[PDB]
Structure formats: C-alpha cells, structure tokens
Design a protein around this ligand. Sequence first.
Ligand SMILES: *[C@@H]1O[C@H](CO)[C@@H](O[C@@H]2O[C@H](CO)[C@@H](O[C@@H]3O[C@H](CO)[C@@H](O)[C@H](O)[C@@H]3O)[C@H](O)[C@H]2NC(C)=O)[C@H](O)[C@H]1NC(C)=O
Ligand SMILES: *[C@@H]1O[C@H](CO)[C@@H](O[C@@H]2O[C@H](CO)[C@@H](O)[C@H](O)[C@H]2NC(C)=O)[C@H](O)[C@H]1NC(C)=O
Ligand SMILES: *[C@@H]1O[C@H](CO)[C@@H](O)[C@H](O)[C@H]1NC(C)=O
Ligand SMILES: *[C@@H]1O[C@H](CO)[C@@H](O)[C@H](O)[C@H]1NC(C)=O
Lengths: 115, 231, 122, 535, 132
Amino acid sequence: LLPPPSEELALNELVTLTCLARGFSPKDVLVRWLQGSQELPREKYLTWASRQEPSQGTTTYAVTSILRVAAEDWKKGETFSCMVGHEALPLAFTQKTIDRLAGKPTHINVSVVMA
Amino acid sequence: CHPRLSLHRPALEDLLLGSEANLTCTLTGLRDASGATFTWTPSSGKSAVQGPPERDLCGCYSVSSVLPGCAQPWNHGETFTCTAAHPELKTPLTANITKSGNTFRPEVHLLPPPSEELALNELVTLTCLARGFSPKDVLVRWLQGSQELPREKYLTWASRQEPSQGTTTYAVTSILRVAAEDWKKGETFSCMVGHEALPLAFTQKTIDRLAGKPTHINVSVVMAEADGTCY
Amino acid sequence: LLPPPSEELALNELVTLTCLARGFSPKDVLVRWLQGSQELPREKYLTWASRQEPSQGTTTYAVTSILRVAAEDWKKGETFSCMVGHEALPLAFTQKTIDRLAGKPTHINVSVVMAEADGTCY
Amino acid sequence: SPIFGPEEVNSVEGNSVSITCYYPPTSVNRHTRKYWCRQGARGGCITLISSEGYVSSKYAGRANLTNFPENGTFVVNIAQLSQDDSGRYKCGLGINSRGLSFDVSLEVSQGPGLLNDTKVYTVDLGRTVTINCPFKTENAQKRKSLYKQIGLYPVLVIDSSGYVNPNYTGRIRLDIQGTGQLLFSVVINQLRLSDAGQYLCQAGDDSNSNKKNADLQVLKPEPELVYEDLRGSVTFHCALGPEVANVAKFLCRQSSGENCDVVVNTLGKRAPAFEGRILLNPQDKDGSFSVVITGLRKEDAGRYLCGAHSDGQLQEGSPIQAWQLFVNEESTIPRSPTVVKGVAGGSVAVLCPYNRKESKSIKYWCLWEGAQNGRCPLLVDSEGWVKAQYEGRLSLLEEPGNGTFTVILNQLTSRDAGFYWCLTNGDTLWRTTVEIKIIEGEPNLKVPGNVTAVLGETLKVPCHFPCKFSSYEKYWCKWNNTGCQALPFVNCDENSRLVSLTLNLVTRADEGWYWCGVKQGHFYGETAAVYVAVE
Amino acid sequence: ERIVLVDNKCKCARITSRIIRSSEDPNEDIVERNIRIIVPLNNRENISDPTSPLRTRFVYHLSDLCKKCDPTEVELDNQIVTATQSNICDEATETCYTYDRNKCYTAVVPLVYGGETKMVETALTPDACYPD
Ligand SMILES: *[C@@H]1O[C@H](CO)[C@@H](O[C@@H]2O[C@H](CO)[C@@H](O[C@@H]3O[C@H](CO)[C@@H](O)[C@H](O)[C@@H]3O)[C@H](O)[C@H]2NC(C)=O)[C@H](O)[C@H]1NC(C)=O
Ligand SMILES: *[C@@H]1O[C@H](CO)[C@@H](O[C@@H]2O[C@H](CO)[C@@H](O)[C@H](O)[C@H]2NC(C)=O)[C@H](O)[C@H]1NC(C)=O
Ligand SMILES: *[C@@H]1O[C@H](CO)[C@@H](O)[C@H](O)[C@H]1NC(C)=O
Ligand SMILES: *[C@@H]1O[C@H](CO)[C@@H](O)[C@H](O)[C@H]1NC(C)=O
C-alpha cells in the first residue's frame, strides 16, 4: 500500500491511495477497501484485471487498485485499509493500512551560514 | 446474421511517434463477398483497398478498408464519412467520426519502492500512475539512464473509467522490476506518458534513491554578504 | 561608488561621496555627477588626475572623484549617480547609482522557507 | 495581486449567484488551473470546484465553472443557496498555497415566510415613492397622521395638514384625487438614507391604539467592475434618467476618510493632477455622456461616483451611479517617453504604440484643447487629410510598423507646447499622451531662408549636418497630403556636409514645401523645412 | 516592507527595505532590510532529467542578486546617452535553482518505432509550453 504523492496534497481536493499485489499462481483474486472498520461500497473505487507478469522463472500474475478519499478526512488522522483474498493464502485474507504519518521523514538537518 | 457497420479512430502510436495515419471502416455480416466500394467525402487519393476477409462464429465474412494520410485533417478538426453499397440491407449504411473535444490532460505520478522490498535485496518495483484524462488512449514507456528499455521488461494494464466526481475521466498503471544493486549504485529510471491533450505530446517524471523516501533531509543555505551595498 | 563614512553623518552638516574607477589601459577618462536625474554643474565636485598603479604584470591606471552634498537630502532619500566614460566599454558609458536604502542597514530580517510543493517560484 | 472581482456579494435563499474573476491574459494563465475555494479556520483553504474536472460533494448538481480565455475571465455559478454558505471565499489560479488569489465575501440572509402582513416599495435614492395608508371615511373629519417610531414610541412629529417634521424640510407634498373615496398618498422626492424604515401611518383615528405596518427600502447602487492596466485608458458611462437632464452633473472619487474629491464638473472644475489627460463629452437627447481618462497610474484604483446636483459636488439627496476600478500593472503595454524636447525651429518625432492584432486600423493625432471641458480637434488621419493651419509641417508615417507608427512635427515655436493624443480605430483602445516641451538651443540641420525661383533657369538648395549624423542616412522629399516621398536628384556631396538637390525646370508643378531628413532605415529622426516660390 | 530592491526568479529571492524615522533624537534612525528565500527540496543540480542527485547546497551572494544589467538612458548636457549599470554580467552560464513560471523547459529523448529511432521532444513544465 503506497502513500500519496506529495505533489497532490497542494491542491486540497482528494488524495490517492494505491494497492498492488504481485506474484501469485492461480489468477483469481478479490480486492476490498475500508475506512476504519466500515467496509466501503464497491462503487467508490476502481480495480484492474489480472494480467501476467514478464519473468523467466514461472508464470505469475499481478493486479492494481486505487481509492480517492477527501483531503479533510486525510488531515484529521483517519486510517484506511486494503484487503486481498486468494486461494493460496493460509487465512484467506491479508490486510495493510495507512494514515497521514509514515511518509514523513525521520530527521531534517538545516543549516544557515551568515558568512 | 444481419450486417452492421462501424468506424475506427486512427491509432495513437502512429499520430505521436509516426508518419502515416490510416483511418479504417469495417462492415460485418457479409455473406461470401460483394461489390461494395466505399465512399469517403474527402477523396484525395482514396486507395480503399480491402483484401481477404476474416472468419467469424460458425463461418462468416467481414471485409474492411483503409484510407491513408490523415494527420492535418484529423488534428485541424475535419470530418469524415464512410458508406458502402451491398445486398443484405434496404438502404446503404453510413458512419461518421470526428476528433473529440472537451478533453483533459493526465496527471503523472511515479512512486518509490515500498520500504519492505529494500531489505530482501533481490529486486524492487516502480509504479507509474496516470489519472484524470478524458479520451481513453495513452502510451507508457520506460527509460534507464537515458536509454529506452524494450517492451518485454514491464507490464501495462488497460485504460478504465474511474468513479465520478463531475466529468468522466480515466486512468492506467504500469510496473517495472529492476535489480536491487542498481538502486543503491545510484542509477535513475523515468516514466513517459503520451496523450492527445498534453502540449508537446509527452511528459516525464524521474526518481532515484535520494529523491523519494530518503530518511534524510540535508540542506545547506549560505547567504554571503547581507550588509553589502545592494545595487 | 562608496557610501559616506559613519562619523561624518553624526555632525549633520555635509557628507562625502567617493567615486573610484580602476584598471583601464589608456590614460583618458571622464567623470560626471548627477542628482536625481539632473546633472550637477561642474564646479561642485573635485576630480583628480589619471595615474598608473603598481604592476600586477601589465600596466593599468586609476582615477578618483568626490562630491559633498547636504546631510538633509541624504537622510530624506534623494539619489546620486556617478558616470564614467572610457573607450574600452561597449556602449562607451557606465553608471552607478546609490541612495540611503542601498547602503549599510541597521536591521536585517532573514526568512528561509522550505518548499516541498514545487520548484516553480510564483 | 493581479486578480480582481466583486468584494461583496449578496442574495437570499433559493436564488442564484454569478461571480466573475479576472486575470492577465498571458498564455500561462489561460492554460493553468482555476479554483474556487472556502477559506475556513484551522489553516486550510479547501477547494470546492475546479477547472480540471473536479466537483465536490457539497456542490453536487448545483454548480459549474466555465472559463473564457479571450475575455481573461472565468465565471462561477452557485444555485440554491443556504445559511451554511455564509463566509469568505477566494478566486485564484495555480496552487492555493501561493498567493495568486483574491478574497470575496458572501453574505446571504433569511427570507420572509408565513409573514405576509407587509407592503413594500422599491426605490433607488433620488426618485419618487408612495406610502399608501387606508383612508377611512368613518373618520371623515379627522387628521391623517403618520408618526415615526424611535424604539416603540410613535412620535408626534408629522401631521397631515401643513405641519411637517423639522428634519423632513421642504419636500413633502400630497395630492387630492379621492375626497369622497379612499384615495390619498404621500410622494417624496430625494430620498435620504435616514428616510428609511416603517412608519406608524393611518388616516383618521378612533382612540383605541390602532396600528398599521408598511415599509420602504431604498438601496445604494452596485458598482460595475472595470479592469484596466498601466499606461492605458478607461471610459465611464454615466446614464442617469431624464428627470435630472438639466442639472449640473459631476464625477468624483471616494477616498478613505469619508471624503469624495472632485475630478470634473460641468461648471468648469478640474483637479491639478488630471491636466491634459481627461475629457467630458456633450450629452445626447436622453442625458448620458462619456468620460475618458488616459495614461493610468498606480494610484487610480478605487470607487468612482457620477451624479447630478445643483452646485457640482456630492451632497445627500442626489442620484448616483458607481464603478470600481483596478489597475493591473503587470501590463504588456510598452513603455514610451512621456516628455519629448525640442528647440525653436527644430523637429520632434513620437513613438505611438498600438496592438498587433488590430493592424488594419485607422490612425489619428489629437491636440488637447482644455478650454471648455476637453476636446480633440483632429490634426491628421491615416487616410490623407490634414488641418489647414498645420500645412507644410505635419505628416503621419506608418514605419516601423508592427507595433508603432510615427508622426513628424517641425518648424516649432514656443506656443507649440502642450499635450497630444494618439488613437486607433480598433476595438481595444490605448490612448497615449506625450508632452512636447520647448527649451532653448540651436537646430542641428541647417538650411537657408525661404528660397525663391528664377524664371528660365535652375535652382540648387544646400542642407548641412553635424558629425554625429555621419553614420545615418540622408534624404530629401516633397510634402503633400499622403505624406512625403523620397527623391532619387540628390547627391550627398561631402562626407560630413552639404546634402543638396536641384530642380531641372522652373514651372509651377512642384511649387511646394520641401524637407531634408535623417533616418536609421526604419526609425526616423530630425528634419527641417523651407518653402519654394516661383516669381 | 515598502520598497522593493530586487525580486529575482532564477534564484527566487526577494529583498525589500524601508526608512522608519523617529522625530526625537534626529541623529539616529533605523533602516530595515528584509530577505526572503524559498528553498526547493526536490530540484536537480542541472535542469535536465538524469543529471545528478538533489541539489543540497544553496549559495546566494548579495552582489549577484541585486545585479542590474539592462541599459538605461542618462541626459548629460543636451544629449541622450545609453549606459550600462553593472560591471559583472558577461554573457546562459548562470545556474538557476527554480523554474520560472513564464518560461518553458523541454528535453529530448530517443525512442523506437519498429525500425529506426526518432528524436522525441518532451515538456518538463506543461503549463507553459503550449504553442499559440
Ligand atoms: C544541463 O543539461 C542539458 C541537457 O543535457 C545540457 O544541454 C545540452 O548538452 C548537450 C551535451 O553536450 C549539448 O549537446 C549537443 O546537442 C546538439 C543537438 O541539439 C548536437 O547536435 C551536438 O553535437 C551536441 O551533442 C547541447 O548543446 C546542450 N543544449 C541544448 C540541448 O539546448 C546542458 O549543457 C547542461 N548544463 C550543464 C552546465 O551541464
Ligand atoms: C465574455 O464574458 C461575457 C460575460 O458576460 C460573455 O457574455 C455572455 O456569455 C454567455 C455565455 O456564457 C452568452 O450566452 C451571452 O450571449 C454573452 N453575452 C451577453 C451580453 O450576455 C461572453 O460570452 C464572453 N466572451 C466570449 C467571446 O464568449
Ligand atoms: C453523425 O452520424 C449520426 C448518426 O450516425 C448523426 O446523428 C449525426 O448527426 C452525424 N453528425 C454529423 C456531424 O454528420
Ligand atoms: C452550468 O453552466 C451553464 C453555462 O455553461 C449555466 O448556464 C448553468 O446555469 C450552469 N448550471 C447550474 C448552475 O446548475
């Protein structure tokens, strides 16, 4: 689950989240989004089909998805999640989440030299 | 069964990166063959050659045609018409096409690798997303350094329509997998998008190891002679 | 052009401006002065002669000039110009203008703004 | 900073509104992103509707945003208003965290619902009104009194028989067309701001504290927005009604400390700082007129008022009209010399800039009179006409072209000083003013006096020049209405003197005015003039 | 904050100044000088794509910010002479730190079209390269 690009936050409209799943052998999959605990309806996002990825080892597949949420809900500290269902997972679902932190850097060094 | 006639826009890769620009007009539902010769309202060299038909469900014939030289009429805003005379209908069938208006230009974003893939040290992946453009034709190519990678290194999905917030717009994605040693040597990779609405038909964004999740922001500002008789 | 000395401004009588031109190979030069956009008459300023300076390899020359103005319109904010004409300059003339704002200030405010947004400088 | 629109806008609920913002028409600005956004508290400036296809959730179905590039404007509509919609807003271009914006204040008030006990009369200040109250004949011989309420007390200060209030002086008259019926009224001219509100009106009184409610509302006019730039011109259009078609009419500018300040009158007044760059046209049949102000500077920004009053000033009780002006100052109008100098006997030449997209126009050259109100007598046109008394000393030239024409005026005298105007025929009109001063000195080119002619042999006329003109071209010409065209029998004898010309035959066919000139190919320079006879 | 001395766009720096005069003690006043720098945290050193890392060192000299070289007009006795106003702007070679909103920036990239390769041109700031 990838954080939004920083060029997007300067227009105050809607931020964009991106989910990617890669490298699974039977090509059937599900993708569901959340906000907190409330599962969102399906008419609010967009997922692509499941193409085949170009390696030389075996045959594997991939799929993407995007969800655009409002800027005011992003700056408050609301969290959002992405879930994927596959036949070959042991507990049939796996989940990743995000919020307005975790893209911020760990340290900033500024120096101003008056010489 | 019954015939039906359709018209087809010129391919995007020939208008941007090309010289020729052929329109094409097909008609399905032809029984075996016919004496259909098409009519095109600008007719400056209408070399409307058809060729051998194709087979359909349970055996059927469908024949088409082309017309060359369509850069300046298609971009200046001309109009075209295709119609043919054939047995299995009452009236000969017609079709028209025009370069679209009310367009939007795409917003391109290049995302860095996720932080978890960097520790395993086999390969990384780079995502290229284009968003919010009104006709649904795009082109995605990748570069390493300044040299174009061949097509079989990456994977591009198709253009689809995204949920509505006003006008109807589209989107696309693509991914590229590169060796995790070159990400730390300091090479650069960049993504290119070609669309009708952009000013010079292409734009690009670039990323490497320092720009994009750096865990380090170092900046030095030196202001030399601030009390310095400024004229 | 050199701004007036600090100790000469504390007395509130008259202040001195100095014009120094340097590094030119022939022995001919011009110096005029202007107030606002009005050229001052030639008997209000003193100009020395052109002499050659110590040798950093090849021979070059130098000249100086001074002008004393009232300490009221310096502090009010009029402008003064020194113009110099010589044969090697492309348009044959060059100018320097100074006033009280373009000198040593007393207060300095520095504001450094870091911008993650864009690099376009509106 | 270069962005401008209406500062204040008002409506009531259920209605529409239509806001317009302005930007300099450069190519970056036509193609960039436009936004409308709500400046709330806690920092952010959240976008509501945008030019790139974005419509919000709260504005769904009610709004759109269209962009007009050749105007330089973009318009925003909001239907079905509310009282959650009251607040400060912003137009803009680009990114919101920069400052290419402009603040707008939107106020919206509640309408009247299930209270229809009202009788209203709409009026703008300076016109007539009626306030009708029920005339009962069961109070046949009873006073038709109308109070005024300060607080809750109907104050006995207006009677209906010849007693009027000490503040409503000189302007209450009433008509008798009932007198047996229910019909009287009160007609007020010159409504004030202090003449507002409901009044305790009635006609005849049974003594049991009986009431009646009927109000008026008088409104202040809303200013038309004008968008101008540096070194350009403006035109107002005062269009008051024929009720005041023969009153003195004025035009001032509202300032900070409640002080309108006069710019023109029709009784002959003028500011000191508007000399040579203002006009006032004679009115038409219905009472409207034009005012032109050219060469606009930075400090001309503010609200302007035109009206009509008997002494030529802003006093209460006079009908007004309004405008609000903005000077862009990021302009593409080229700079020009404001003053050009010459000496007695010399020439001048002026650069006159127009727009490249209007190159098929017709060009004119004024001379600002300043006597009555302001007037352009035209001196020379681009079609081949000149004034009578300027014969032999004026012509208009089309070179260099492409942004600029020139005009030559020689044989100067010290009374030729003044302010001069140039104007094209196209749609957008910059009017440019230049001042000709006269200082003393000597003419550069040198020609003899007024040269005669012999009958039956040749003439020759010399014309010197100094040595800074040694790299410039030299020419002669013969002047007529279309201009003057160069001659091929000149020789240019010396390397730094004596350009001459002869005439092979003394007959009357070319007994005209001649010049002697200097040019760097396109751009023109100084000249002189002598007139030829034939005896 | 009243009179603008320089507003430069290759380095994106702005310097204003103002005299604020006390009436008591006319021997001492104060003269203020305000400087504003905007640092771009995501630009390259040379402005093309693959150049070098992020520019991480930003150097401003006051004598190169305030430099003024477009010619002017001076009236000496009764003459109009054209003068220059600076010693140091020999022609560019200046390294810019930001883009400028009214100029547009392009690059050239080779791609393939089945047979041979072309010389495709690419916009880097799309708001300003519109051909009109
Ligand atoms: C910053 O990067 C740019 C982009 O590379 C540099 O501009 C270009 O640099 C190249 C490399 O020498 C120059 O190449 C020439 O290209 C022409 C085609 O236009 C070709 O015919 C020549 O044989 C030569 O290879 C090019 O002049 C130059 N300028 C352009 C394209 O406008 C720039 O020099 C870099 N600046 C610094 C300080 O490194
Ligand atoms: C310039 O802006 C004006 C704003 O009034 C436009 O004028 C009207 O625009 C609407 C379209 O939204 C038309 O239906 C009207 O006929 C226009 N005229 C009037 C008098 O209302 C005008 O269209 C804009 N300029 C251009 C070239 O479109
Ligand atoms: C194009 O064809 C359709 C029907 O096929 C018709 O409704 C439409 O008006 C045509 N447009 C033009 C411009 O001919
Ligand atoms: C949408 O825009 C049109 C003009 O393009 C305007 O006339 C109309 O009122 C708008 N619709 C609204 C505000 O619902």
